[PDB]
Design a protein around this ligand. Sequence first.
Ligand code: A1CEZ
Ligand code: ZN
Length: 417
Amino acid sequence: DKDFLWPAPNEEQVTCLKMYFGHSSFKPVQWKVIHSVLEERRDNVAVMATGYGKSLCFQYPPVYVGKIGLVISPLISLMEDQVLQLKMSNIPACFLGSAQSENVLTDIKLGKYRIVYVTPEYCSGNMGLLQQLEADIGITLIAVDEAHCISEWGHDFRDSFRKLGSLKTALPMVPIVALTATASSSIREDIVRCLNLRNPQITCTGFDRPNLYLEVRRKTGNILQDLQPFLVKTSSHWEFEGPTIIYCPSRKMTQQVTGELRKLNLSCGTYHAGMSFSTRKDIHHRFVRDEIQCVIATIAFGMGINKADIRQVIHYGAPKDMESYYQEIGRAGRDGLQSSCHVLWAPADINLNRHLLTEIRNEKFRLYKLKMMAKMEKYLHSSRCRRQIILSHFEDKQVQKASLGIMGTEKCCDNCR
Ligand SMILES: Cc1ncnc(C(=O)N2CCC3(CCc4c3c(=O)n3nc(N5CCOCC5)nc3n4CC(=O)Nc3ccc(C(F)(F)F)cc3Cl)CC2)c1O
Ligand SMILES: [Zn+2]
């Protein structure tokens, strides 16, 4: 479990997790948030469907470094429940408010508490307190739960969240972890703007995505022969069933593939590292406008596409690894309508070529890259449920419990069919 994280949690981080939280391992997304907070001091928008595996992301870092973490939330009963859990785990924690202040505030200032829960109403009155705690202790992170409540445009607006924009003014070097259940690109942008987040890490987890069909199929090598099954012949030209992305492992392939689809007069365009920002922009704009149907691309394309109606993702060549693959298929069917994700792989794919990783001189990184390639190859070669493999590696056990409906049916994956 620890072998698939970059960089690997050290031995004292694992010991800390076991002692204080009772867990043996970090899930990749949990590690993604914790490491970015601890080492990069990086702002996060962590979209989480449920509270399962959620709290660790903001509770673990201040416990590990033995400093202080702030959790800003309006969910009073849930905050009280979490304060009791932390206390019962021998983590010193409290609810800080006007009524509680006499009991706790001197102790908070003296650095006796790892985790302090506050309402957004209390926080806007006490930016001076946070400055003192930053100076005297050092604030590992500020968590803003129900972060969607800052957006006037969302369904559950709270005026109390408006003044949380000042956190980055008052405390420009403390990273903010914004947490919400809503996967709206619109609300994410509102959260980023209203909390003044700087280049935030965006993750989205806890969702089972029942509308994504998964298939792995052997690649002949003949590009037209390989992609012919996906095409529909109109009087004018051949075309895909809907908005499509074809992810290719190199820039040489993106040209080759686009060349073969060009011969069919298919409305498509190439994207890669080595193209004009102006051309990349109109591709992005045409795709969003539905002026080109398909996009042939490298790992470069997809981040902040926000396009809800991607019906088909094809990996023409084995993906880089399971992390990139997860990001790439995650962009399919955000509208919640039926989408398909196909891998077309051969044994001669660059991303299954060990020789290139054998030549990497940094040993810890070499052994990570080989372990990730092998995990990818074990997914592609599997006869077991494609969905079960992906949820098991990336998602909390709760996501698998919810997903038992789709799993096993003719719409789950090629192996369940
Ligand atoms: C601005 C920005 N900055 C950085 N990066 C990206 C980016 O390009 N990405 C970041 C987000 C990704 C990554 C993960 C993921 C993404 C995503 O947009 N949505 N939208 C949903 N839906 C929307 C509709 O309501 C329900 C949830 N859920 C997600 N998820 C989770 C997911 O898809 N989990 C999953 C589950 C099962 C399987 C199966 F195969 F086992 F079935 C696969 C997966 Cl991946 C997309 C990439 C960005 O935009
Ligand atoms: Zn399946």
